[PDB]
Design a protein around this ligand. Structure first.
Ligand SMILES: *[C@@H]1O[C@H](CO)[C@@H](O[C@@H]2O[C@H](CO)[C@@H](O)[C@H](O)[C@H]2NC(C)=O)[C@H](O)[C@H]1NC(C)=O
Ligand SMILES: *[C@@H]1O[C@H](CO)[C@@H](O[C@@H]2O[C@H](CO)[C@@H](O)[C@H](O)[C@H]2NC(C)=O)[C@H](O)[C@H]1NC(C)=O
Ligand SMILES: CC(=O)N[C@@H]1[C@@H](O)[C@H](O)[C@@H](CO)O[C@H]1O
Ligand SMILES: *[C@@H]1O[C@H](CO)[C@@H](O)[C@H](O)[C@H]1NC(C)=O
Ligand SMILES: *[C@@H]1O[C@H](CO)[C@@H](O)[C@H](O)[C@H]1NC(C)=O
Lengths: 581, 135, 581, 135
């Protein structure tokens, strides 16, 4: 009664009415989903036959009891998922046989303590997920000494109310442990003084823990001494929220050393709480889903190297002049905003996509105040009016304008200064190519994606004469009807050419001679009747030629081309599926 | 029909999609007034897949004139706004989601909306609700 | 011989080395342009035979002498142009014969005085242009009382330096006169005290007059008493300009009563000049080519009924709360401002074209604060995000988005509230019509311009079923390849249908059989091979049916059609230039 | 043929258009640095039409690669910035027009630019100039 998804490998036994592991299933199977079946109990030696099983999903199988040696033969299992089974008590010997387990998920299994959770011999464990249980204590049990590969523990949505000095003793006694800890959705109301002295965490997540501003202040105070690589803080819209959020609640974080700081949704945000002095030395600042309206505060002494602003609500483009910022992200912002000049000397990475962004006077040094920009993403935005061809930004190596409206790009050589550019995407920008010099200066270009545009008179013109280093070129959906003579002659290094979904009446073989390195040519969804111009000239490197969904006139008047299918059979794609029209 | 409420300007009901019937009890307090509503969406179910990347395909029809498929993302997979985004397959979800809106001019009479909930990581359909709105 | 643009009406005689009035060239014309010929001396009775003449142009004709009675039989003439002839002095009876003259242009004729200028007899005169001459006095002569239809005298670019009370006595004793005065480019440095007491003017143009701001200041003070309907002030970029331009130079203005005020280019400009209190009772405020950067501190008691900002330099969309403002134009702005909410309860006319404006959340009552809006022009802008379907703006009759980047317009019925809309232009907005309800609500609409867009599957869908009042429909350049059945059946009043520059392979009679009112059908620049259906079923009212630039297929299976071409050739346009493909 | 000037980065010169030769003496001070110049364009002539609606069609080629027609307006017809806009057919024009620009990056080479002057009200060609730029 199971679904076979990958033969002898993967099998879907979800939502039948199985009371037992079905026994007709192949011995070699690597993946089995058996969730949502009433199994009630795991009998000893149940999975003996599946010696190569790697992933086992038993979520919501109503299991109250695991018997000793249930998993006996499963030496290769790396993932065990037990979510939603009311196994209140786990016997010693519950997990024996799992010699390679790496990921244990025991979410909502009415588990009360980690001390009695018999996982001390799961030496290979990397991830432990015990969210949505009844755990009252934050105590990291001594058997974690056996657990030398463990990197993440999820303690989310439990009943933890206090963190004490003894709670984190294991971590204190073992500074070498690289551990991360999700403590979200626990009603924490007290942290003992000095609890976090001598402790190191990779990632600590504290989302939705606090009901009172006073409690959050005084808890973050006793975080004193902690070294975290990444502290994640904030709340949820569908939960108990803070009444007021003042920058002063953050006091306490001054005695914690933080590499990366992430603020998530906050009910009562104020713009100045990311301007807070105890965040000065953080090297990465992140806002996600935050009601920030303006960012025009930031003192110059602030040591931020990256700022990331995701699904926020800026009404204006933020005025910034941080000497150290190497990386700026502002994406999925509300409404529209119009670009404003910034001053970022260290800036090498800039992602400004998906904001309905307006940009009048793109783009030069005076816009950004850097000489080291290597990456610029301006995709999924509004009108971007080209006014400047990247003077001062010649280190640029990745440029993306996809789906934005480019304006005035054909009025001059807009990319002239970009002698180092490797990747350029101007797909779906409503550009009508009518200037042969549009790609002048792009002598290092490898990838050119220009799908969804058009050309004067719908003829592909001599715009590729200087783009020698091109290995990838996409001209689909460009409404093309014709191809000029020597248009590809220079592209000695070209590996892929997508010319699909155009209006080409026929091909011409002389266009593709000189394309010595062409592996893939894609001419599907055209109106191609036949090819002309001597068929020997098609590249010897041509492995995948797509002529599907075309309008071939099947007769005898173009019988030369119809003969090229035989020896060139493994080279055309979907050969035996093509039909005349 | 699984549920209905009447409002001062709409009567809203839903049933399960024909060919996908994984259970969900969903309800709103108060009943949606298309001209503008403040309130909560009450949701109580056990999802048949992870919610980390939950989005919706909405197929909407106005007096048999259909709109292009509309895609609503609710969980992006990173620092998400709603607690349920972290809910795993088989986990009990019981949450009430605030909502608010002012109200555009809507025609006219009879609305059909099928809402497909989808786990973005696997592209597996999670549940499907067939909505009927009379405005 | 002279270049004849119109058979027996109009003749071009430019640079034709003529030394006399062409005798051997037809004596039948109404308009003749004789400019740039070396005539030298204009003989008498030269225009005896021409008596059907209305318009005559003698610009730079080297004319030194106008002989007595040279305008013999010219009594229908209304326009005489004498620009650049060095005639200097006109002897009495110079214009005797011209008994119906409306317009006299004597620019650069070395005219020294108006007193001795023999135009006293010409009662019919309307417009007098004496710019670029040697007039030193602003004196208005008594014979003006004979000239009882005189409405505009141009004294630009002369040597007038003073205006006295006595200069303007004519107007003082003649309040009933409606006169307008361009006094630009005069080095005016003194105006007599009380010169402008008891004088009315329609328009007064004072551009580029003053060299010092002090002379400007004192001159404006002596405008006291003036009643002007329209006052135009400012400078030119290519002339002498004032160093500093304080609003305090403008203090003489509160002692003049001004209906309409126009400011043009100024070298220096202070934003708070528009706030200036002596302009509070103006009904129309205009600024053109002005360096204004912000407009936000405008008092609520200001009486402005229209406000026009043309070619200025706004860095922010003005914040406006004017309660009596009916008409607002902001156009051709330098930058790329984004729309900002405004409160104008009297507003019925709004023109925001050509600013590269971004507009998120277009459009409803709360953006504008009016329920009276009849005209909205948002053409030639940047991205406009549709978010509201015009709630509160259902008095709209004219709406223009042409060449702007509309968004989400197919996401719902973006126009549903617009039941009184007559004119809609969404041409070149990059709209892909995906939704049959896109025009729902548009039941009054006459003109639908939607060129340069596209449709799903290149098919023309049933988007017009309820746009029943359409008389003008432009669907050119829409990449159309097919037309769904029934699409036009509802359009009984449609008069013009343009579908040129698409990709139709053929026409079908039945698409047009219910277009009982169609006069013009344009299908030029498609790929039409023939038409199908009952050919006699094309609308009988059809007069201009454009089928040029297609690819007609002269084969024996399109005979009914080919026959039909010959019978219906009266209505096919340029049928005789049509060639087979 | 008519005028010649040299700058650190450009040499600039012009003649009348082959089949249109109406007289205009035009000059810039200083000569144009393409990277950035401030100065005046001196223009003396007798135009053959009303300047009320004056604009230029500009036909540019870079090393024989040609740009789309560039339409540039100088007189719009309402409260124009410049003194010359008011000049009539036959009237003498003698003025100094200021200009400034910050300078884009231009391909080095041989630029051709025919500059046609149009009286926008009648569509008549007033004058046409054939520019040569070496950068
Ligand atoms: C040629 O370009 C076209 C884009 O028009 C690509 O077409 C897509 O093909 C994928 C399968 O790989 C389909 O799922 C999509 O329907 C097509 N995408 C779109 C956006 O239409 C095609 O993949 C290109 N060829 C190559 C080798 O990349
Ligand atoms: C139909 O639409 C087209 C524009 O898409 C109009 O075409 C113009 O026609 C004139 C001739 O009168 C040409 O000189 C222009 O070049 C065309 N404009 C373009 C291509 O943008 C056509 O005039 C319209 N037909 C009617 C009857 O109005
Ligand atoms: C339009 C189309 O279907 N193109 C296909 C493309 O999807 C595929 O990537 C390629 C090689 O696998 O073959 C071709
Ligand atoms: C180490 O794991 C082993 C495996 O059986 C167990 O005997 C021992 O008690 C574990 N260490 C601790 C501290 O629990
Ligand atoms: C510690 O573990 C995390 C995984 O959570 C890993 O990304 C990080 O690099 C580790 N740090 C070290 C020094 O191994």
């Amino acid at each position: 009664p199971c679904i076979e998804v990958v033969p002898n490998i993967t099998y879907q036994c979800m939502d039948q009415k199985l009371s037992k592991v079905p026994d007709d299933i192949p011995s070699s199977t690597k993946n089995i989903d058996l969730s949502f079946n009433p199994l009630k109990i795991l009998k000893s030696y149940s999975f003996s036959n599946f010696s190569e099983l790697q992933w086992l999903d038993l979520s919501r199988c109503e299991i109250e009891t695991i018997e000793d040696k249930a998993w006996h033969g499963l030496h290769h299992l790396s993932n065990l998922i037990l979510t939603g089974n009311p196994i209140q008590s786990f016997s010693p010997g519950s997990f024996s046989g799992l010699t390679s387990l790496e990921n244990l998920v025991a979410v909502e299994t009415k588990l009360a303590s980690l001390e009695s959770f018999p996982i001390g011999q799961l030496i290979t464990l990397k991830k432990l997920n015990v969210a949505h249980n009844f755990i009252h204590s934050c105590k990291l049990p001594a058997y974690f000494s056996n657990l030398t590969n463990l990197v993440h523990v999820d303690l989310s949505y439990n009943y933890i109310q206090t963190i004490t000095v003894n709670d984190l003793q294991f971590l204190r006694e073992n500074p070498q442990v690289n551990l991360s800890l999700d403590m979200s959705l626990n009603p924490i109301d007290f942290i003992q003084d000095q609890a976090f002295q001598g402790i190191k965490l990779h990632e600590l997540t504290l989302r939705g823990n606090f009901n009172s501003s006073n409690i959050m202040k005084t808890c973050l105070q006793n975080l004193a001494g902690l070294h975290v690589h990444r502290l994640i803080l904030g709340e949820f819209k569908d939960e108990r929220n803070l009444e007021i959020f003042e920058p002063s609640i953050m006091e306490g974080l001054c005695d914690v050393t933080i590499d990366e700081f992430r603020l998530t949704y906050t009910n009562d945000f104020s713009d100045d709480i990311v301007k807070f002095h105890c965040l000065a030395n953080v090297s990465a600042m992140s806002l996600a889903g935050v009601s920030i309206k303006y960012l025009e505060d930031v003192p110059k002494h602030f040591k931020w190297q990256s700022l990331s602003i995701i699904r926020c609500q800026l009404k204006q483009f933020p005025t910034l002049d941080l000497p150290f910022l190497k990386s700026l992200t502002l994406t999925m912002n509300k409404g529209s905003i119009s670009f404003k000049k910034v001053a970022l000397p260290s800036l090498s990475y800039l992602d400004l996509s998906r904001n309905a962004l307006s940009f009048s006077g793109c783009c030069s040094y005076s816009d950004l105040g850097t000489n080291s920009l290597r990456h610029l993403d301006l995709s999924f935005n509004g009108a971007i009016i080209m006014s400047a061809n990247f003077m001062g930004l010649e280190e640029l190596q990745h440029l993306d304008f996809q789906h934005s409206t480019l304006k005035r790009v054909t009025e001059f050589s807009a990319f002239l200064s970009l002698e180092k550019l490797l990747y350029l995407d101007i797909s779906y920008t409503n550009t009508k190519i009518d200037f042969d010099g549009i790609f002048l200066g792009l002598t290092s270009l490898n990838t050119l994606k220009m799908a969804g545009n058009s050309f004067k008179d719908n003829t592909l013109s001599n715009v590729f004469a200087n783009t020698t280093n091109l290995t990838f070129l996409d001209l689909s959906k460009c409404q093309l009807e014709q191809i000029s003579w020597g248009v590809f002659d220079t592209l000695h290094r070209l590996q892929l050419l997508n010319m699909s979904h155009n209006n080409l009446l026929f091909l011409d073989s002389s266009h593709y001679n000189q394309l010595y390195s062409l592996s893939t040519l894609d001419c599907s969804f055209n109106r191609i009747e036949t090819s002309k111009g001597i068929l020997q000239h098609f590249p010897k490197s041509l492995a995948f030629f797509n002529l599907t969904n075309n309008s071939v006139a099947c007769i005898c008047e173009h019988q030369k081309f119809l003969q090229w299918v035989k020896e060139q059979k493994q080279f055309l794609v979907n050969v035996e599926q093509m039909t005349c029209a | 029909q699984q549920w209905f409420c009447n409002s001062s300007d709409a009567i809203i009901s839903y049933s399960y999609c024909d060919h996908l019937k994984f259970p969900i009890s969903i309800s709103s307090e108060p009943c949606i007034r298309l001209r503008g509503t403040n309130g909560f969406v009450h949701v109580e179910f056990i999802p048949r897949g992870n919610l980390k990347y939950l989005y919706f395909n909405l197929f909407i029809s106005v007096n048999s004139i259909e709109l292009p498929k509309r895609k609503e993302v609710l969980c992006h997979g990173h620092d998400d706004d709603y607690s349920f985004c972290r809910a795993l397959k088989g986990e009990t979800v019981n949450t009430s989601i605030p909502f608010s809106f002012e109200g555009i001019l809507f025609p006219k009479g009879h609305y059909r909306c099928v809402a497909e909930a989808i786990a973005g990581d696997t592209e597996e359909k999670l549940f499907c609700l067939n909505f009927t709105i009379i405005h």
